mmCIF file of all heavy atoms in Angstrom:
data_model
loop_
_atom_site.group_PDB
_atom_site.id
_atom_site.type_symbol
_atom_site.label_atom_id
_atom_site.label_comp_id
_atom_site.label_asym_id
_atom_site.label_seq_id
_atom_site.Cartn_x
_atom_site.Cartn_y
_atom_site.Cartn_z
ATOM 1 N N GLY J 1 102.813 -86.962 -39.136
ATOM 2 C CA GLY J 1 103.880 -87.867 -39.501
ATOM 3 C C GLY J 1 103.680 -88.445 -40.886
ATOM 4 O O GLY J 1 102.566 -88.518 -41.406
ATOM 5 N N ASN J 2 104.786 -88.839 -41.508
ATOM 6 C CA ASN J 2 104.703 -89.409 -42.841
ATOM 7 C C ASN J 2 104.104 -90.809 -42.784
ATOM 8 O O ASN J 2 103.994 -91.425 -41.721
ATOM 9 C CB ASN J 2 106.078 -89.460 -43.499
ATOM 10 C CG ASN J 2 106.607 -88.098 -43.843
ATOM 11 O OD1 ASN J 2 105.858 -87.222 -44.264
ATOM 12 N ND2 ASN J 2 107.913 -87.916 -43.709
ATOM 13 N N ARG J 3 103.702 -91.301 -43.946
ATOM 14 C CA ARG J 3 103.107 -92.622 -44.020
ATOM 15 C C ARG J 3 104.175 -93.686 -43.785
ATOM 16 O O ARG J 3 105.299 -93.551 -44.271
ATOM 17 C CB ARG J 3 102.456 -92.831 -45.379
ATOM 18 C CG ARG J 3 101.255 -91.953 -45.628
ATOM 19 C CD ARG J 3 100.782 -92.110 -47.053
ATOM 20 N NE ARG J 3 100.324 -93.464 -47.327
ATOM 21 C CZ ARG J 3 99.066 -93.859 -47.211
ATOM 22 N NH1 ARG J 3 98.134 -92.998 -46.847
ATOM 23 N NH2 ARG J 3 98.734 -95.109 -47.480
ATOM 24 N N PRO J 4 103.863 -94.738 -43.031
ATOM 25 C CA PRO J 4 104.857 -95.790 -42.791
ATOM 26 C C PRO J 4 105.099 -96.606 -44.050
ATOM 27 O O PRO J 4 104.161 -97.073 -44.694
ATOM 28 C CB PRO J 4 104.222 -96.629 -41.678
ATOM 29 C CG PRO J 4 102.772 -96.384 -41.806
ATOM 30 C CD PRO J 4 102.622 -94.973 -42.280
ATOM 31 N N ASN J 5 106.372 -96.758 -44.406
ATOM 32 C CA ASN J 5 106.756 -97.442 -45.638
ATOM 33 C C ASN J 5 107.856 -98.437 -45.286
ATOM 34 O O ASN J 5 108.994 -98.043 -45.024
ATOM 35 C CB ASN J 5 107.222 -96.451 -46.694
ATOM 36 C CG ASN J 5 107.305 -97.064 -48.069
ATOM 37 O OD1 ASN J 5 106.996 -98.237 -48.257
ATOM 38 N ND2 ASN J 5 107.723 -96.272 -49.045
ATOM 39 N N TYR J 6 107.509 -99.718 -45.271
ATOM 40 C CA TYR J 6 108.472 -100.782 -45.042
ATOM 41 C C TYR J 6 109.019 -101.252 -46.381
ATOM 42 O O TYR J 6 108.248 -101.568 -47.290
ATOM 43 C CB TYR J 6 107.818 -101.951 -44.312
ATOM 44 C CG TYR J 6 107.364 -101.655 -42.910
ATOM 45 C CD1 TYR J 6 106.049 -101.304 -42.647
ATOM 46 C CD2 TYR J 6 108.247 -101.732 -41.846
ATOM 47 C CE1 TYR J 6 105.628 -101.037 -41.364
ATOM 48 C CE2 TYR J 6 107.833 -101.473 -40.563
ATOM 49 C CZ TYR J 6 106.526 -101.120 -40.328
ATOM 50 O OH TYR J 6 106.117 -100.858 -39.046
ATOM 51 N N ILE J 7 110.341 -101.306 -46.503
ATOM 52 C CA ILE J 7 110.990 -101.765 -47.725
ATOM 53 C C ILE J 7 111.898 -102.931 -47.379
ATOM 54 O O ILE J 7 112.861 -102.773 -46.620
ATOM 55 C CB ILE J 7 111.777 -100.644 -48.416
ATOM 56 C CG1 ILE J 7 110.827 -99.556 -48.906
ATOM 57 C CG2 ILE J 7 112.565 -101.193 -49.579
ATOM 58 C CD1 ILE J 7 111.527 -98.332 -49.414
ATOM 59 N N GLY J 8 111.595 -104.101 -47.937
ATOM 60 C CA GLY J 8 112.400 -105.285 -47.737
ATOM 61 C C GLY J 8 112.287 -106.184 -48.947
ATOM 62 O O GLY J 8 111.630 -105.846 -49.932
ATOM 63 N N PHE J 9 112.932 -107.343 -48.869
ATOM 64 C CA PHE J 9 112.867 -108.290 -49.967
ATOM 65 C C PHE J 9 111.508 -108.983 -49.997
ATOM 66 O O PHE J 9 110.698 -108.869 -49.075
ATOM 67 C CB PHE J 9 113.974 -109.331 -49.857
ATOM 68 C CG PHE J 9 115.354 -108.770 -50.007
ATOM 69 C CD1 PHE J 9 116.194 -108.671 -48.918
ATOM 70 C CD2 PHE J 9 115.825 -108.382 -51.245
ATOM 71 C CE1 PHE J 9 117.467 -108.174 -49.059
ATOM 72 C CE2 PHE J 9 117.094 -107.873 -51.385
ATOM 73 C CZ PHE J 9 117.915 -107.773 -50.293
ATOM 74 N N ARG J 10 111.266 -109.719 -51.073
ATOM 75 C CA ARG J 10 109.994 -110.398 -51.248
ATOM 76 C C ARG J 10 109.928 -111.659 -50.393
ATOM 77 O O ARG J 10 110.913 -112.088 -49.788
ATOM 78 C CB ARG J 10 109.781 -110.759 -52.712
ATOM 79 C CG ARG J 10 109.716 -109.573 -53.633
ATOM 80 C CD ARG J 10 108.444 -108.817 -53.421
ATOM 81 N NE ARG J 10 108.386 -107.626 -54.254
ATOM 82 C CZ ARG J 10 107.829 -107.596 -55.455
ATOM 83 N NH1 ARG J 10 107.281 -108.694 -55.943
ATOM 84 N NH2 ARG J 10 107.815 -106.476 -56.157
ATOM 85 N N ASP J 11 108.732 -112.240 -50.335
ATOM 86 C CA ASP J 11 108.563 -113.577 -49.784
ATOM 87 C C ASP J 11 109.328 -114.567 -50.645
ATOM 88 O O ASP J 11 109.311 -114.467 -51.869
ATOM 89 C CB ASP J 11 107.081 -113.951 -49.763
ATOM 90 C CG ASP J 11 106.797 -115.231 -48.995
ATOM 91 O OD1 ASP J 11 107.720 -115.814 -48.392
ATOM 92 O OD2 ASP J 11 105.631 -115.671 -49.012
ATOM 93 N N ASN J 12 110.040 -115.491 -49.993
ATOM 94 C CA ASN J 12 110.795 -116.580 -50.625
ATOM 95 C C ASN J 12 111.832 -116.102 -51.638
ATOM 96 O O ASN J 12 112.239 -116.883 -52.504
ATOM 97 C CB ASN J 12 109.865 -117.601 -51.288
ATOM 98 C CG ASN J 12 109.015 -118.341 -50.290
ATOM 99 O OD1 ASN J 12 107.794 -118.211 -50.281
ATOM 100 N ND2 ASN J 12 109.655 -119.126 -49.439
ATOM 101 N N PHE J 13 112.267 -114.842 -51.514
ATOM 102 C CA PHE J 13 113.160 -114.159 -52.455
ATOM 103 C C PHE J 13 112.648 -114.246 -53.890
ATOM 104 O O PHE J 13 113.375 -114.612 -54.814
ATOM 105 C CB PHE J 13 114.587 -114.690 -52.352
ATOM 106 C CG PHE J 13 115.248 -114.389 -51.049
ATOM 107 C CD1 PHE J 13 115.394 -115.372 -50.091
ATOM 108 C CD2 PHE J 13 115.748 -113.132 -50.790
ATOM 109 C CE1 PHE J 13 116.011 -115.099 -48.896
ATOM 110 C CE2 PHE J 13 116.361 -112.858 -49.595
ATOM 111 C CZ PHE J 13 116.495 -113.846 -48.651
ATOM 112 N N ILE J 14 111.364 -113.941 -54.063
ATOM 113 C CA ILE J 14 110.802 -113.790 -55.398
ATOM 114 C C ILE J 14 111.419 -112.569 -56.058
ATOM 115 O O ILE J 14 111.600 -111.526 -55.423
ATOM 116 C CB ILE J 14 109.269 -113.689 -55.309
ATOM 117 C CG1 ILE J 14 108.673 -115.039 -54.934
ATOM 118 C CG2 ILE J 14 108.650 -113.200 -56.594
ATOM 119 C CD1 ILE J 14 107.233 -114.983 -54.620
ATOM 120 N N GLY J 15 111.804 -112.707 -57.322
ATOM 121 C CA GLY J 15 112.318 -111.570 -58.047
ATOM 122 C C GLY J 15 113.769 -111.258 -57.791
ATOM 123 O O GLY J 15 114.228 -110.180 -58.169
ATOM 124 N N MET J 16 114.499 -112.148 -57.132
ATOM 125 C CA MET J 16 115.945 -112.007 -57.069
ATOM 126 C C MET J 16 116.595 -112.583 -58.312
ATOM 127 O O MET J 16 117.656 -112.116 -58.740
ATOM 128 C CB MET J 16 116.471 -112.710 -55.819
ATOM 129 C CG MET J 16 117.945 -112.542 -55.548
ATOM 130 S SD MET J 16 118.348 -110.827 -55.249
ATOM 131 C CE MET J 16 117.478 -110.612 -53.713
ATOM 132 N N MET J 17 115.937 -113.554 -58.931
ATOM 133 C CA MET J 17 116.554 -114.467 -59.875
ATOM 134 C C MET J 17 115.683 -114.568 -61.117
ATOM 135 O O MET J 17 114.462 -114.704 -61.007
ATOM 136 C CB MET J 17 116.723 -115.835 -59.218
ATOM 137 C CG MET J 17 117.734 -115.870 -58.085
ATOM 138 S SD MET J 17 117.798 -117.425 -57.171
ATOM 139 C CE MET J 17 118.620 -118.530 -58.311
ATOM 140 N N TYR J 18 116.307 -114.514 -62.291
ATOM 141 C CA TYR J 18 115.558 -114.519 -63.540
ATOM 142 C C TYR J 18 114.994 -115.899 -63.846
ATOM 143 O O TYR J 18 115.607 -116.670 -64.588
ATOM 144 C CB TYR J 18 116.437 -114.063 -64.704
ATOM 145 C CG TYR J 18 116.809 -112.600 -64.717
ATOM 146 C CD1 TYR J 18 118.027 -112.174 -64.223
ATOM 147 C CD2 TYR J 18 115.953 -111.650 -65.248
ATOM 148 C CE1 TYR J 18 118.380 -110.844 -64.244
ATOM 149 C CE2 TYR J 18 116.298 -110.315 -65.275
ATOM 150 C CZ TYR J 18 117.514 -109.921 -64.774
ATOM 151 O OH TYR J 18 117.867 -108.594 -64.790
ATOM 152 N N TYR J 19 113.837 -116.224 -63.286
ATOM 153 C CA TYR J 19 113.122 -117.434 -63.655
ATOM 154 C C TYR J 19 112.158 -117.121 -64.786
ATOM 155 O O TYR J 19 111.472 -116.096 -64.757
ATOM 156 C CB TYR J 19 112.352 -118.023 -62.476
ATOM 157 C CG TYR J 19 113.236 -118.599 -61.409
ATOM 158 C CD1 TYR J 19 113.491 -117.896 -60.252
ATOM 159 C CD2 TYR J 19 113.812 -119.846 -61.558
ATOM 160 C CE1 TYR J 19 114.286 -118.411 -59.273
ATOM 161 C CE2 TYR J 19 114.623 -120.369 -60.578
ATOM 162 C CZ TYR J 19 114.855 -119.640 -59.439
ATOM 163 O OH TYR J 19 115.659 -120.133 -58.445
ATOM 164 N N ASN J 20 112.147 -118.001 -65.790
ATOM 165 C CA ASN J 20 111.242 -117.957 -66.944
ATOM 166 C C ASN J 20 111.383 -116.674 -67.756
ATOM 167 O O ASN J 20 110.435 -116.235 -68.408
ATOM 168 C CB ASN J 20 109.788 -118.170 -66.527
ATOM 169 C CG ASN J 20 109.572 -119.510 -65.887
ATOM 170 O OD1 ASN J 20 109.185 -119.598 -64.726
ATOM 171 N ND2 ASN J 20 109.838 -120.571 -66.635
ATOM 172 N N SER J 21 112.559 -116.061 -67.715
ATOM 173 C CA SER J 21 112.947 -115.014 -68.650
ATOM 174 C C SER J 21 113.832 -115.684 -69.680
ATOM 175 O O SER J 21 114.975 -116.036 -69.376
ATOM 176 C CB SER J 21 113.696 -113.879 -67.961
ATOM 177 O OG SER J 21 112.873 -113.181 -67.054
ATOM 178 N N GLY J 22 113.300 -115.874 -70.888
ATOM 179 C CA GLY J 22 114.050 -116.569 -71.916
ATOM 180 C C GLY J 22 115.266 -115.808 -72.397
ATOM 181 O O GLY J 22 116.268 -116.423 -72.771
ATOM 182 N N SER J 23 115.212 -114.473 -72.357
ATOM 183 C CA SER J 23 116.285 -113.657 -72.917
ATOM 184 C C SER J 23 117.576 -113.774 -72.120
ATOM 185 O O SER J 23 118.661 -113.593 -72.675
ATOM 186 C CB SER J 23 115.846 -112.199 -72.995
ATOM 187 O OG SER J 23 114.780 -112.049 -73.918
ATOM 188 N N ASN J 24 117.482 -114.082 -70.835
ATOM 189 C CA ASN J 24 118.663 -114.303 -70.001
ATOM 190 C C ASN J 24 118.398 -115.469 -69.047
ATOM 191 O O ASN J 24 117.978 -115.289 -67.902
ATOM 192 C CB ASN J 24 119.032 -113.015 -69.285
ATOM 193 C CG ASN J 24 117.841 -112.336 -68.669
ATOM 194 O OD1 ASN J 24 116.719 -112.827 -68.766
ATOM 195 N ND2 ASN J 24 118.073 -111.198 -68.022
ATOM 196 N N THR J 25 118.682 -116.675 -69.520
ATOM 197 C CA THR J 25 118.472 -117.895 -68.756
ATOM 198 C C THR J 25 119.762 -118.329 -68.076
ATOM 199 O O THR J 25 120.864 -118.106 -68.577
ATOM 200 C CB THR J 25 117.973 -119.036 -69.655
ATOM 201 O OG1 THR J 25 118.934 -119.300 -70.684
ATOM 202 C CG2 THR J 25 116.658 -118.685 -70.296
ATOM 203 N N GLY J 26 119.610 -118.969 -66.922
ATOM 204 C CA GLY J 26 120.716 -119.654 -66.298
ATOM 205 C C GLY J 26 120.986 -120.970 -66.981
ATOM 206 O O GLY J 26 120.241 -121.422 -67.848
ATOM 207 N N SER J 27 122.079 -121.609 -66.582
ATOM 208 C CA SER J 27 122.506 -122.813 -67.283
ATOM 209 C C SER J 27 123.150 -123.778 -66.304
ATOM 210 O O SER J 27 124.163 -123.448 -65.687
ATOM 211 C CB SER J 27 123.474 -122.474 -68.409
ATOM 212 O OG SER J 27 123.943 -123.653 -69.036
ATOM 213 N N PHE J 28 122.574 -124.965 -66.178
ATOM 214 C CA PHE J 28 123.250 -126.094 -65.562
ATOM 215 C C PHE J 28 123.694 -127.032 -66.673
ATOM 216 O O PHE J 28 122.876 -127.465 -67.487
ATOM 217 C CB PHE J 28 122.349 -126.824 -64.571
ATOM 218 C CG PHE J 28 123.021 -127.980 -63.887
ATOM 219 C CD1 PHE J 28 123.942 -127.765 -62.882
ATOM 220 C CD2 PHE J 28 122.737 -129.279 -64.256
ATOM 221 C CE1 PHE J 28 124.561 -128.818 -62.254
ATOM 222 C CE2 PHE J 28 123.356 -130.337 -63.632
ATOM 223 C CZ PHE J 28 124.269 -130.104 -62.631
ATOM 224 N N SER J 29 124.985 -127.336 -66.709
ATOM 225 C CA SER J 29 125.551 -128.146 -67.774
ATOM 226 C C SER J 29 126.838 -128.762 -67.266
ATOM 227 O O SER J 29 127.483 -128.224 -66.368
ATOM 228 C CB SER J 29 125.834 -127.308 -69.019
ATOM 229 O OG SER J 29 126.855 -126.364 -68.765
ATOM 230 N N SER J 30 127.217 -129.885 -67.860
ATOM 231 C CA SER J 30 128.519 -130.447 -67.552
ATOM 232 C C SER J 30 129.604 -129.651 -68.266
ATOM 233 O O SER J 30 129.321 -128.793 -69.093
ATOM 234 C CB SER J 30 128.577 -131.914 -67.962
ATOM 235 O OG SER J 30 128.447 -132.044 -69.364
#
């Protein structure tokens, strides 16, 4: 049998969202 390979999202959804990437930052503003 082939090797078992589980593919899912990260813990706490790490890597869904660009944190501390200066080139594409999010913006909270009025």
Side-chain angles (χ1 to χ4, degrees):
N2 291 322
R3 293 173 63 93
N5 194 1
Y6 294 96
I7 295 172
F9 295 108
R10 298 289 177 93
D11 190 4
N12 294 115
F13 294 104
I14 289 171
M16 185 63 67
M17 292 173 74
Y18 289 98
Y19 291 101
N20 299 118
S21 294
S23 294
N24 46 0
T25 60
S27 177
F28 181 75
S29 66
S30 64

